[model samples]
Target: SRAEDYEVLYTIGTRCQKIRRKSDGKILVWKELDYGSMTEAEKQMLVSEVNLLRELKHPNIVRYYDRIIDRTNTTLYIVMEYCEGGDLASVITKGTKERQYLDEEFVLRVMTQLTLALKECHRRSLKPANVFLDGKQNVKLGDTPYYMSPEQMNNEKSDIWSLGCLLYELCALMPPFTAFSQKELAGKIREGKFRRIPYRYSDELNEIITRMLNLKDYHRPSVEEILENPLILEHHHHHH
Candidate 1:
């Protein structure tokens, strides 16, 4: 009854919303039919992404609330919890001009949470696209350039590369390489010629950073393994 009467009020991406619920003020998200000329494989991927979100359950990860399809309107609606806190990138951008680098304790706290989230994702065979910074500067793992892993760049072990990039950015406030062109960026990523702590960072931090950015994905530690490291656990405990 309630589901049947849901009326669409807005549209964004493949998302749609039932303008308003008559019984209650609650709104509903629906999927629109026009997915922009997606191939069969792409459509399957989109469905898979939604299914992954639906099945995943974790505190740090965003929650998928519900989904609805209206054949009459040719729409599909996916309802997800609204994160009041914006992403981490915006939070970082607001604070300092020089891009304030996070302290070891703070970085570890964020990373620990992120590691747990990633572990959950990996368990389900879903690799995150990127890990973003939320409004409170908390890490939100998803898909994007700055948070993408090296494997991701080559369409290989992208999540591992993504984790490394996140660690690097937390320490340095920048990516491994800053290039003017995609070609230059790709070359630098392939060569693994990105910035590191040099003598400024401690040996432990350096080691973690090195491991995440390891050119070979097999060399990189799994999320659980990384979380088990004494350095990481220590850092996490010291902070919180």
Candidate 2:
């Protein structure tokens, strides 16, 4: 359907909006790229990103249904599934201020679903903000980033490091590496040393986190190995 076929429920940003399909009344998110404002290469890259989304078919990942090009406006409208519960970044932010730390069970719930999604798109950008939750609290990996690895900052590599940062952030309510300046943050990331997570979580969890956060890119475990871990398996069995 065209952009005109959807009812704008809310304006999320200057270019993104919450919309409902008029034909079926299905709620979805509409993100727009102003091609006229972007370079030719930028336009192509943005379109390619959306095109890649169309190939993904997994429960934990946001589903891209269609795209509508508003030629007259030089805009590209991307239609995708909408998660009503909001992004994980806000949840963590609120949790930090309220001191309502998530229990290990809830944290595992998010982690399991996220890892499952990452298994589908391996190099996929990951961060607290990119992870979303639905009304039922099911984790949905969206397209975004911020929790970059040292290699990422240097040349952009490894999804594992970002995963480690996220897992640590979930447990500690703060990133393992944080600084007032980007240069300092880079130094800390390069150094690969950060305070341990709280003592409440099991050593197995923390140990796995350490391996995931390993500064040596090749030293980290594969996504498959993480899924096979006993703790992760224990969490998975409870749901099934």
Candidate 3:
């Protein structure tokens, strides 16, 4: 809490608040986290996230400025540039004046956009050169097994699987499943089943990923379907 003004955007499981820093007249995301509930790994990850954000600079990424830990309450403050466009889920729908949650809309919207971006790479005949960026940096893509479904295979489907894998990666900063070989990996990708997204991203986002990375290509969400998903339809916000 600041002496100046702040508008609470929304609090997800981790108590994330997109606020206005009145003194600086800036909108910033204040991730108020309870150290008590978080695993030691997650707590340490925050430290690494701050360091990584410090090193990286890009237009499409979050610009992290400060990290404050209140020893008294076990509260950690992750302060960064406020994304006025709101989180991805809320961007699709209008200002939910009812204070409706942007939960489902936010998660799905982001994954959809990420999927689109992945496809764009193909327009340039590009693929992710780096397998994954686990905290400090790592080439391994599948650090966690649960995030990958059993059917992760080749072609567009491969990207689809990773697109859906973002739900896990973004949340855990790693993949849900590990694969030493392509076939064994896709087999694992095809094996995992999800009803709703788990981790910080549960439910709607999980469901979207389910459809986005279905074992059968025929069931995948097309560009149009990705844009007009049930959760996406409910929000009206955009980064640009």
Candidate 4:
């Protein structure tokens, strides 16, 4: 309900954290902004981002509850849902230790939810680690990543491109493009060059990712189109 009523459970950045509400004992996320730490423009940008997030209400997306800015030139607290499974980066780390990637079925479930969340939104940088989970293991798109795309990034189509990148990261433990220099990375993207998806995953799964990563956005499929893809339905089962 109030900043004083919430306790920080996880620190995600200089300003981002997962918070637990003391009264209800329900957990949520909180982004704190101290006046000394941000420019006036940066503060306004944070407000804009949270305001935009407030309008997005899908099960797959993190819910933005509210924000509190002090009367004095001090701190701003933005509150939202808290995901226990944490970022996909932690998932990748733990999974990599076991040397196992997500199953095809789980991957499908994750992608399906992501598609719905992506609906009508322009784009937020889709980073693998930024994905979240509730008490259950389902995917909940959360937070922003500090990466940029190739030429002219915009809405869902280019959004799908990032999805493809995320899928590859989940399965392969790295982004499609590796340690090449910046110019080389940009050149490779421009020329349609990247490492192949690993062979260990199903061909259908690889195919789905390939479709998303098409060189041209027009070639990429929509959320509904991807949901209808037979590969995903071939082994459709969701765990709570």
Candidate 5:
């Protein structure tokens, strides 16, 4: 359950404000920053982007509620579903430190959900900038550079690259070339010289990962093709 009051929850690139409703006793607020210097065009672009994001409806996708512009403060307020669980990066960090690498079954379950979400986005011709990791260690295909596809690294097929990155994270628990500086990372990504998975991972999983992280966007498997793979079909049964 969400609490009322303008409590500061978390801060990263943007500050999150928890606002409680006076009329219905519901708690909701914005996860945004102060936009004092933004032009009218920029503000409008934000609104349009938020509206477009809100149109996406899927169980695996985060729900967008509303947006408000504070006239007095010159701040943009984006009201979204309150996810009590923090992002996936936090979850992975904690879980790994605690010796909880998320069992194979759990990983498969979350990956299936993520795949479905990505498939829906692809169907709608909408590409997510990043695939965020939720507090529960569940992947939320949203925004983060670590999960970007190779094309996205080159400013081309950003969404596809993001998906491939997500796959890499799921298997390796970290992005490829994570140790490299931005420039070095960009160069390696462009040259297509990222690390491959060890032979220990299942052949099926490796195959999927290889196909997704393919340097050529055209060589990458489509969402439908991926879903049709025997590995995906056998995932649930094998786990059960």
Candidate 6:
């Protein structure tokens, strides 16, 4: 309704805030796109992005609740679900620091939920920074990116590649491909080279990861196939 309808819990960077809906006391994340500092093209792009986001409806996808256009302030306010456990990046960071791998079951669960989310509304922007977990550890695919596929600059299938990278990160506690610069990164991603994950995780799961990260986009499994895979079927308990 209005900007005053929510109380700012804190600011995130320059254009976002952690807020709570005042009337119902529901915590939510608030983001602002300041039109004053943007070009017309940028403004249009953001509005279209919001439109796309509003169309998405999935349990594993972040819910877009509301938006307020402040013509007077030249800003647009977006309200979204606030995930309590934060992003997978933090989870990976914590695990990496302690030299621990996330449990195999947890990784499988996230991969399953994320694949389901992609089936609903597929997009290339996926990575640890955006894949969030709720208090119950239910995975939510938040909009963002970094785990780019080798062919990403060109497929809708690219999302699968990114998904594979995230799954690998969960198992290994690091990205499958990392480098000192974009040039180096692109080379490694193009070559599709990465060390195998530790033997603690099942080889079946590791093989699935390899397929998803295949250098050839067409060779990669589709979302439907991924959902129907035996590994997912065995552990995909939707109780959460």
Clashes of each: 23, 1, 30, 1, 12, 0
TM, every model: 0.68, 0.87, 0.39, 0.82, 0.72, 0.88
Estimate, for each residue in 20-102, the C-alpha lDDT of model 2 and write its tens digit: 99899998998877787888898878878777788888888887888998889998888888888888889899998998877
Please estimate how well model 6 matches the true structure, expressed as its whole-model Cα lDDT: 0.84
Q: Judged by lDDT relative to the true structure, which candidate is superior, 1 or 3?
A: 1
Cα lDDT for residue 215, candidate 6: 89
> Taking the tens digit of each residue's C-alpha lDDT, what string does model 5 give over 1-240?
222234544553447666665556555446765789988898788778878898997656766776666667777667765545546666556655776454555555555667777777767772222344344544455532445455555433354455566556655666755644767666667666667654446777767776777788888777667667776544432120
Q: Lowest-lDDT window of 10 residues in candidate 3?
A: 134-143
Candidate models: Cα lDDT each: 0.61, 0.80, 0.51, 0.73, 0.60, 0.84
Q: Give the C-alpha lDDT of model 4.
A: 0.73
Best by TM-score: 6
Misplaced by over 4 Å in model 2 are 38-42, 123-125, 144-146, 153-157, 233-240
Q: Candidate 2 lDDT (Cα, whole model)?
A: 0.80
Error of 6 at 27 (Å): 1.6
TM-score of 1: 0.68
Give lDDT: candidate 4, residue 63.
77
lDDT ranking from best to worst? 6, 2, 4, 1, 5, 3
The per-prediction CA RMSD against the true structure, in angstroms, equals 5.2, 3.2, 12.7, 3.7, 5.1, 2.8
Candidate 3 ranges with C-alpha deviation above 4 Å: 1-14, 36-45, 88-160, 164-240
Residue-level lDDT of model 6, residues 23-49, one tens digit each, is 999999978877888888998888898
Q: Higher-lDDT candidate among 2 and 6?
A: 6
Instruction: State the lDDT of candidate 4 residue by residue for 1-240, as single tens digits.
Output: 456777788787777887777888887778777766788898788778777778887777877887877657587887888777777888878888988777766677778777767863544437876688777666788772213456453255778888887887788777776545766666556665566666878888888888887888888888778888886652342344
Q: How close is candidate 4 to the true structure, as a TM-score?
A: 0.82
What pairs collide in candidate 4?
89-129
